[PDB]
Design a protein around this ligand. Structure first.
Ligand code: CD4
Ligand code: CD4
Ligand code: BCL
Ligand code: BPH
Ligand SMILES: *[C@H]1O[C@H](CO)[C@@H](O[C@@H]2O[C@@H](C)[C@H](O)[C@@H](O)[C@H]2O)[C@H](O)[C@@H]1O[C@H]1O[C@H](C(=O)O)[C@@H](O[C@H]2O[C@H](CO)[C@@H](O)[C@H](O)[C@H]2NC(C)=O)[C@H](OC(C)=O)[C@H]1OC(C)=O
Ligand SMILES: *[C@H]1O[C@H](CO)[C@@H](O[C@@H]2O[C@@H](C)[C@H](O)[C@@H](O)[C@H]2O)[C@H](O)[C@@H]1O[C@H]1O[C@H](C(=O)O)[C@@H](O[C@H]2O[C@H](CO)[C@@H](O)[C@H](O)[C@H]2NC(C)=O)[C@H](OC(C)=O)[C@H]1OC(C)=O
Ligand code: MQ8
Ligand code: 0V9
Ligand code: V7N
Ligand code: CRT
Ligand code: LMT
Ligand code: FE
Lengths: 273, 335, 62, 40, 71, 99, 299, 60, 71, 60
């Protein structure tokens, strides 16, 4: 089916690879060449996840756990029961996430939009690629990746944190947390302002950009404007993921002690050493 | 291709807004001004603020709360102004000792803490009232004060959960690294907060808030050249920027919001972050005392092979004691 | 006494019932524009059925 | 804004003299500090 | 040399200069105040021969074979 | 500085008044003369339009803007004459005149 | 800039130790190069001549002299018999001035302490064991000496305190466990100190998804617990009662004797001296009837 | 040299001066109060011979 | 070969060149200063035979390991 | 060589140079102050024979 205004927009063009061959829709979904590759990697990766569950101890959704190999295998592919299945699924996930980004570019090109969405999603792909590729590769073993399991990856996060005794003291982590918290605040403010001028109390005219700028101005002391709040939201949300990737890649490859003792440089500034 | 990430041409207007919309009681404080730096990223006007009675009292109550915290931190380094700056992130104003329960503690052993907490709480409530009155004066919906009420709810659970377990000692210390020490020790005391399902939900909405604002920020910038940032007019008088935004997400993931309703998705994801959070805190130590064991009971916990096995005499030998009071003497061991 | 049922489990299902109710509400709101859908088989609503298209009243100025 | 060479020459007279006077004060301060507690 | 003031606004120069000298003076005092030898607020009344000195290079053997402190 | 931008931090500044020959300042001057003459043309067209529709406070500003555009042009014409004089006395300078 | 890692738990749990490879090699070579080598040992007959020997009653005369050479190099530098003795009269416990030879009477207690460690705490020190070198490392003062300071000092877990547990062993709250979050902060501070004392992280002894679990923890946690019990005996019965023996320059501001902690032996390494086995070579210090099946050569 | 006040608006200078003097005075007082020797609130009634002195060089 | 420059503003070439040399110089100095052998601020007065040289081999006792045991 | 001042604005190069020298001077002073050999505020009165030296090779 189509939105009442949609049909006019469904032209050919804007593809990156396939030309007209895959330039069609399936229900609501645009396909394209990277749609085909997406569904390939999604299906293969999903069915291998189901196989991992089948050969594991339970079907309980929360307890399924497909673990990476032991560190002794280094950068080789382990036996599939022993973590090689995790390594294949990781390749499928990279293939799927990459295909999804490039498919979004084909869609943006067909609509004459800017490329912002593909790149903003690249911030998440960067963070994933850091956790499963870049950081494991710098540590010299694929076994440093997180396990694929709804709670077992939380056991990994816990243990990686305490590998540095008190992970809250990681300075890039403090920045990343600040971005996540500031983003959620900014999202609530922006959502509230737009809804408050479009849904004023009954018997009140629809509001205006002037009213939301006046309200925003006496909240923060300055008016950010309509383009400004969207630039800020993009900056905060994507900046959180980028600082997240930094905070985890410095932990291990570049810093090995507890994080609290990193702050020794601040105590030793010569003005007060 | 222009990315619309910063503004190469700003325009000034000599008269200005900042003189509010018709607002009645209270006073507009200061004269509007332009920052060229603010004008690069967003709108350039830095300008007048409204307080009214609730805003004035909120600042008075809040300033006292900030003074009490800072003066106690500064007293804790013996009034040394160098050590005050050098050690600032490790300093705290610390809650009362556990043995008092809910009784009033000595002034230097948590009495200042409860005072600062009281004036901060009153200041936060008066700020909520200030925002509520301002939204109505500008003839707006009440979405913003209810969004702020969700944050206040989570904050209040750092008072109610200590109340429910029966001791002010459990409250959060005022201090940069010290409140992170509390955050870690809370998860330790209650047996790993990852297995608290409302904590898991709160994270799902915190991450989802970043997902939505990244998607929505990027979407509007991607159609901003077609006027897509004029969101109110795209809601009342749908243009091609809205249509393209709907079609992008429809063609990408098979469903779409509207230019209005994406702001409801935004509002609920942010609000549910702190609302589910508060529920998880209130349940901790009152209903569940070990979240990992609650996870085992309800089947959350993935099995691993055993890393050690105890014999029955080790099971008796390796039980400890619960931690007690500190030794209040300096023993001589000489005989 | 109930061994398995506990107050954290009860509260969690109360949230799930609310949350699915919320998703339904949000999906009705998502359908105020562009619906009903055009198709070869005639108009289509999906599910849930969308809320009606909303009219906005502008102000008379001053 | 203007700034003529006579204004610059008048300003230079004050700026040099003030600079040198400050260095003279600082020289006495170092003379006092050294006689109290030499650093070499 | 006076033509340097044709080149720069003297109102900008003097403000930058006074800000530079203030910060430099503060830094040097606080560097000294945190040292042992020039902790002058605690130890300023000591004579120069009594003031602390940072320790030498070791006794030339740089090696240990001690005798106890007297009981 | 709008024209040299970041390069003004490294002391490239081809706008500053120049009386010796300099191919860089002459290049900047030739570019800015064309832009400012177009800008004067647009300013006096805008005055003619707003005079025709008669709005008094707008006519005042349009005339004030035009005067500023003429003054900013006159500075570049002065720069052009300095460089053109220096061109004639300096070996290896341009053969095409400035201004 | 390369990082060495050791896996200490199951796949994917991130129970791993990380070391900066350059930093670790300099630490390890800094042990190897000074590591003091032992004399060879020999087996005579004959009855003991000693006038004032009260601990080393049970070893041959050659093994005794061999032990004294070791004690000199491990505590005082080699051949420095003057550190403990009135060298004209080794049996003396006093100077010619009559003033007591405090180091000798301490060293006699340190022999009993070492035998007590190697004998009664084999669940901790196993067949590595300790010698004077473990703490002293060629110098009169070991590392990690501590004194009374404040009531809430966590190093008193190694002396006169006992409980450190804070986690409930059940789902619901109970009167069994009323631990404060402040007490969990205190245990956390204590546990950072133990982690730094060994140069390890929390995952060396815990699966941090449940700190209270012994089944999910590496076996090192059980060894670590016996280390606490050992230090309490070492501090309460041997080190702390030496208060009237030391010169006041050794005592703390409360006048208390210096006490030991994990770092005193471990010195930031997962085993003392990276596991160098020396106690086997010195039967005078076994306190044990056989060392790894090698029988004690008693008289 | 009162013409200094022509190149600098004294309205700006006097605010900058008073802000500087206020902060510097407080810093000096708290540095002294924090010291052993000049902790005058606790020890101000001690005589000059009784007041603390920081430690000398060890041979002194 | 001079025709290479026809493509470039010579002022910008010089600013590009100076920036390259400044970074390269500081990198090489900080690498050397972080070494043992060329830590010249502490050890510059050592003669060439006295200066540190990297180990031609490490060594150990057979029961010692720098790393803890584990799979 | 003076013709470079037609290529570059003297007003802007001077500011850049003063800034560069200040940074480089402060960096070098603090590098020395943090060292053992040149911690001149604590140990400046030691003779050159008495000042610290970084450890030599063992020559073995
Ligand atoms: C804890 C915090 C959470 C935080 C995260 C929370 C996420 C919340 C957002 C995601 C959920 C909304 C998704 C959505 O609305 O998609 C549009 C789709 C259909 O759109 P339509 O406009 O109403 O109808 C179109 C149709 O009339 C004409 O289309 P066409 O003829 O071209 O094609 C045919 C349709 C046939 O429909 C389907 O095939 C449905 C596919 C599955 C629908 C969702 C099931 C539940 C989630 C997935 C479970 C299976 C997942 C493996 O084809 C399509 O329309 C395909 C386009 C829709 C694709 C949606 C994919 C969503 C994936 C969500 C993944 C969630 C992961 C957790 O809607 C539906 O089918 C009904 C959805 C009803 C709301 C979901 C909540 C229900 C709560 C329970 C209430 C009681 C039972 C209903
Ligand atoms: C647990 C809850 C959440 C997971 C749930 C997963 C399963 C969900 C299944 C239902 C999803 C329906 C999605 C949808 O299209 O919605 C719009 C559609 C009508 O809207 P419309 O605008 O008028 O038309 C739109 C069009 O898409 C509808 O399809 P259409 O009518 O054009 O074409 C045909 C049908 C196929 O139907 C048949 O062939 C039926 C023929 C029966 C005749 C009798 C034969 C004789 C023997 C009978 C024996 C019969 C007895 C043996 O459309 C479809 O193809 C729908 C495909 C949906 C595929 C969903 C796939 C799920 C996605 C994930 C898959 C992988 C992972 C699992 O339907 C409705 O409005 C009715 C309400 C549907 C949602 C509420 C009911 C929810 C049921 C579950 C209740 C329990 C909730 C917890
Ligand atoms: C070892 C540490 C523990 C842990 C311990 C805790 C604890 C304890 C808590 C959280 C909480 C949260 N944690 Mg957790 N958390 C851990 C691991 C994680 C990880 C991760 C990747 O590992 C993530 C992403 C999170 C994420 C989150 C958030 C979803 C949630 C806070 C929501 C929020 O908006 O708070 C930020 C918002 C607020 C605090 C609201 C503040 C609003 C008020 C009104 C603001 C007042 C400002 C005032 C006016 C100014 C004051 C000035 C000063 C006085 C000077 N946690 C592990 C398991 N986490 C909270 C929660 O909800 O738990 C269920 C919580 O209490
Ligand atoms: C939906 C969940 C998210 C959320 C939302 C949210 N927060 C909000 C809001 C919303 C929707 C607001 O509208 C409200 C606000 O005002 O935003 C600008 C607020 C707010 N969120 C805040 C913080 C905050 N939010 C956080 C988090 C969150 N906020 C969540 C992520 C966090 C975190 C992560 O820790 C923090 C720290 C504040 C900035 C603000 C509420 C401000 C407030 O209540 O202030 C009270 C006043 C004081 C503390 C005193 C200040 C003292 C002055 C410095 C003294 C100056 C002197 C004075 C003039 C003297 C008096 C003289 C008189 C005569 C005048
Ligand atoms: C000083 O006293 C405190 C308070 O008793 C001791 O700390 C106790 O032990 C810790 C486990 C715990 O953390 C702390 O809460 C507290 O319970 C501290 O160790 C010092 O102990 C010595 O003095 C004790 C004292 O209470 O005065 C003394 O205790 C015994 O003697 C008193 C009478 O003097 C008697 O009331 C007690 O019942 C008695 N208790 C015991 C267990 O014997 C200690 O004596 C002994 C043998 O423990 C003192 O300890 C030592 C080594 O001198
Ligand atoms: C240090 O003092 C102890 C005192 O116990 C001396 O130990 C003696 O020899 C041991 C083998 C024996 O077990 C022990 O009971 C004791 O007899 C040790 O030899 C050191 O001696 C010097 O200081 C002695 C002291 O006590 O001050 C001193 O002995 C004094 O007392 C005895 C009587 O008990 C008397 O015979 C001495 O004349 C007297 N001398 C003085 C100077 O006060 C030793 O004196 C003598 C002669 O041996 C001291 O040793 C020397 C070489 O002078
Ligand atoms: C695998 C398989 C066998 C498939 C079979 C089907 C076949 C054959 C398909 C072929 C075609 C292809 C390639 C289909 C893709 C199939 C796949 C993989 C689908 C999965 C889709 C997917 C990622 C679903 C997840 C949905 C979730 C949970 C998203 C999280 C974010 C979220 C909660 C969004 C809700 C709010 C919305 C709708 C935001 C978008 C949105 C934003 C952000 C605006 O700013 C905006 C501005 C103005 C107007 C509208 C909008 C708007 O709609
Ligand atoms: C914007 C609004 C959103 C609202 C979302 C609501 C979601 C979550 C919060 C719900 C409240 C949870 C209360 C938890 C306390 C609890 O459970 O304490 C139980 C008693 O039981 C109880 O109090 C029962 C509690 C029932 C809660 C209400 C359910 C019914 C209404 C659902 C509405 C959904 C739609 C809106 C005790 O537990 P125990 O372990 O000590 O018992 C065994 C001891 N041996
Ligand atoms: C310890 O470790 C670390 C810290 C690292 C070691 C340190 C290292 C380093 C790198 C130190 C560097 C020091 C330095 C480097 O240059 C220091 C340089 C200092 C300098 C140059 C000081 C100059 C001072 C000049 C002054 C005060 C001028 C006053 C002018 C007056 C009074 C005139 C008033 C009249 C006017 C204006 C005219 C009005 C107009 C009139 C009347 C009219 O118009 O009529
Ligand atoms: C002279 O002025 C100076 C220079 C001192 C000013 C400078 C001040 C400075 C430098 C201040 C620095 C402040 C900092 C760094 C603060 C850091 C604060 C942080 C990070 C706080 C984090 C969390 C705190 C929480 C969650 C606290 C919550 C407290 C609550 C909810 C308390 C509630 C208390 C109540 C309701 C009390 C009621 C009173 C009764 C009597 C009922 O008792 C229960
Ligand atoms: C910064 C801390 C204080 C340091 C001490 C500052 C004072 C130092 C000695 C000042 C001695 C007098 O210094 C001298 O003052 C006269 C004005 O009287 C200045 O005179 C200047 O202004 C006058 C007009 O007012 C001009 O005519 C003259 O050509 C010009 O040089 C001189 O340039 C300066 O050299
Ligand atoms: Fe928006």
């Amino acid at each position: 089916a189509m939105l009442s205004f949609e049909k006019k927009y469904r032209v050919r063009g804007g593809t990156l690879i396939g030309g007209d061959l895959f330039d069609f829709w399936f229900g609501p979904f645009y396909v394209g060449f990277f749609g085909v590759t997406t569904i390939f990697f999604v299906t293969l990766g999903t069915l291998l996840c189901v196989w991992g569950a089948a050969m594991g101890p339970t079907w309980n959704l929360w307890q399924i756990n497909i673990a990476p190999p032991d560190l002794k295998y280094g950068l080789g592919l382990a036996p599939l029961r022993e973590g090689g299945l995790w390594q294949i699924i990781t390749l499928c996930a990279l293939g799927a996430f990459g295909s999804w980004a490039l498919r979004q570019a084909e869609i943006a090109r067909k609509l004459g939009m800017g490329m912002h969405i593909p790149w903003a999603y690249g911030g998440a792909i960067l963070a994933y690629t850091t956790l499963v590729v870049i950081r494991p590769f710098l540590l010299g073993a694929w076994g440093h990746g997180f396990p694929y399991g709804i709670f077992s990856h939380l056991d990994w996060v816990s243990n990686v944190g305490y590998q540095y005794l008190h992970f809250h003291y990681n300075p890039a982590h403090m920045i990343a947390v600040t971005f996540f918290f500031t983003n959620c605040l900014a999202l609530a403010m922006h959502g509230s302002l737009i809804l408050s001028v479009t849904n004023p109390p009954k018997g009140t005219p629809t509001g205006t950009s002037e009213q939301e700028n006046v309200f925003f101005r006496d909240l923060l002391g300055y008016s950010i404007g309509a383009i400004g709040i969207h630039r800020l939201g993009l900056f905060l949300a994507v900046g959180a993921a980028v600082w997240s990737a930094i905070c985890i890649v410095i932990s291990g490859p570049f810093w090995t002690q507890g994080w609290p003792e990193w702050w020794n440089w601040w105590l030793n500034l010569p003005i007060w050493k | 291709e222009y990315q619309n990430l910063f503004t190469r041409v700003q325009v000034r207007t000599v008269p200005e807004p900042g003189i509010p919309i018709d607002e009645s009681t209270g006073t507009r404080y200061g004269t509007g001004t332009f920052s060229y730096l603010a004008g690069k990223f967003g709108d350039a006007q830095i300008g007048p603020i409204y307080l009214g009675w609730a805003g004035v009292l909120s600042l008075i109550f809040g300033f006292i709360a900030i003074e009490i915290i800072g003066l106690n931190m500064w007293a804790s380094v013996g009034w040394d102004p160098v050590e005050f700056i050098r050690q600032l992130p490790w300093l705290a104003l610390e809650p009362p000792p556990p043995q008092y329960g809910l009784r009033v503690p000595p002034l230097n052993q948590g009495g200042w803490y409860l005072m600062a907490g009281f004036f901060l709480t009153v200041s936060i409530i008066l700020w909520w009232i200030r925002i509520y009155r301002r939204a109505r004066a500008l003839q707006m919906g009440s979405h913003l004060p209810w969004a702020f009420a969700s944050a206040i709810f989570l904050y209040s659970t750092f008072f109610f959960q200590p109340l429910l377990v029966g001791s002010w000692s459990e409250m959060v210390p005022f201090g940069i690294f010290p409140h992170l020490d509390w955050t870690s020790a809370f998860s330790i005391r209650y047996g790993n907060l990852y297995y608290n399902p409302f904590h898991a939900l709160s994270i799902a909405f915190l991450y989802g808030s970043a997902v939505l604002f990244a998607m929505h920020g990027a979407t509007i910038l991607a159609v901003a050249r077609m006027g897509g940032e004029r969101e109110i007019e795209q809601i009342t008088d749908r243009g091609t920027a809205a249509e393209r935004s709907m079609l992008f997400w429809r063609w990408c993931m098979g469903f779409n919001a509207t230019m209005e309703s994406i702001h409801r998705w935004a509002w609920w994801f942010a609000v549910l972050t702190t609302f589910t959070g508060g529920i998880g805190i209130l349940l901790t130590g009152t209903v569940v005392d070990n979240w990992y064991l609650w996870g085992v009971k309800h089947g959350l916990v993935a099995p691993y092979p055993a890393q050690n096995q105890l014999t029955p005499e080790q099971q008796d030998l390796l039980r400890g004691r619960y931690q007690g009071t500190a030794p209040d003497s300096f023993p001589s061991y000489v005989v | 006494m109930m061994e398995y049922i506990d107050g954290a489990q009860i509260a969690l299902y109360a949230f799930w019932l609310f949350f699915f109710g919320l998703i339904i509400y949000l999906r009705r709101e998502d359908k105020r524009e562009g619906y009903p859908l055009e198709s070869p088989q005639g108009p289509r609503d999906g599910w849930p059925k969308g809320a009606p298209k909303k009219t906005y009243v502008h102000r008379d100025h001053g | 804004g203007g700034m003529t060479e006579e204004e610059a020459r008048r300003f230079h007279g004050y700026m040099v003299t003030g600079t040198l006077g400050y260095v003279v004060v600082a020289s006495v301060a170092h003379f006092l500090a050294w006689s109290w507690r030499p650093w070499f | 040399m006076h033509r340097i003031w044709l080149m720069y606004d003297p109102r900008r120069v003097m403000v930058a200069l006074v800000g530079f000298l203030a910060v430099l003076a503060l830094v040097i005092h606080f560097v000294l105040l945190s040292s042992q030898r020039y902790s002058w607020i605690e130890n300023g009344t000591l004579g120069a021969d009594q003031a602390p000195v940072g320790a030498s290079a070791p006794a030339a053997a740089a090696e240990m074979s001690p005798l106890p402190p007297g009981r | 500085p709008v024209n040299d931008g970041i390069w003004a931090w490294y002391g490239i500044d081809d706008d500053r008044p120049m009386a010796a020959w300099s191919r860089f300042h002459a290049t900047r001057c030739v570019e800015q003369l064309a832009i400012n003459r177009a800008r004067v043309g647009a300013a006096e067209w805008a005055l003619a339009d707003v005079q025709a529709r008669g709005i008094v406070p707008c006519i005042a500003k349009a005339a004030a803007h035009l005067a500023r555009a003429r003054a900013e042009l006159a500075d570049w014409e002065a720069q052009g004459h300095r460089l053109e004089a220096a061109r004639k006395v300096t070996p290896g300078a341009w053969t095409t005149p400035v201004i | 800039a390369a990082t060495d890692t050791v896996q200490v738990g199951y796949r994917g749990t991130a129970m791993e130790q990380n070391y900066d490879h350059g930093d670790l090699k300099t630490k390890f070579a800094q042990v190897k190069l000074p590591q003091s080598p032992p004399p060879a040992g020999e087996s005579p007959p004959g009855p003991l001549p000693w006038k004032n020997v009260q601990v080393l009653n049970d070893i041959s005369i050659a093994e005794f002299n061999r032990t004294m050479i070791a004690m000199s190099t491990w505590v005082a530098g080699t051949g420095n018999c003057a550190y403990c003795h009135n060298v004209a009269a080794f049996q003396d416990d006093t100077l010619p001035n009559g003033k007591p030879l405090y180091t000798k009477i301490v060293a006699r207690r340190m022999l009993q302490m070492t035998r007590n460690i190697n004998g009664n705490y084999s669940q901790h020190v196993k067949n590595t064991g300790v010698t004077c070198y473990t703490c002293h490392m060629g110098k009169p003062l070991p590392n990690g000496l501590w004194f009374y300071s404040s009531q809430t000092d966590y190093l008193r877990h190694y002396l006169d305190r006992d409980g450190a547990r804070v986690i409930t062993q059940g789902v619901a709250p109970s009167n069994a466990n009323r631990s404060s979050t402040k007490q969990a902060e205190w245990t956390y501070a204590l546990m950072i100190s133990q982690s730094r004392s060994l140069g390890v992280n929390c995952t060396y002894c815990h699966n941090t998804r449940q700190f209270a679990s012994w089944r999910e923890a590496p076996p090192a946690r059980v060894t670590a617990y016996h280390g606490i019990l050992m230090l309490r005996d070492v501090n309460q019965n041997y080190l702390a009662p030496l208060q009237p023996v030391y010169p006041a320059v050794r005592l703390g501001a409360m006048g208390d004797a210096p006490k030991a902690q994990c770092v005193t032996c471990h010195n930031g390494a997962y085993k003392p001296l990276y596991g160098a086995q020396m106690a086997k070579d010195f039967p005078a210090m076994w306190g044990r009837a056989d060392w790894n099946g090698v029988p004690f050569p008693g008289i």
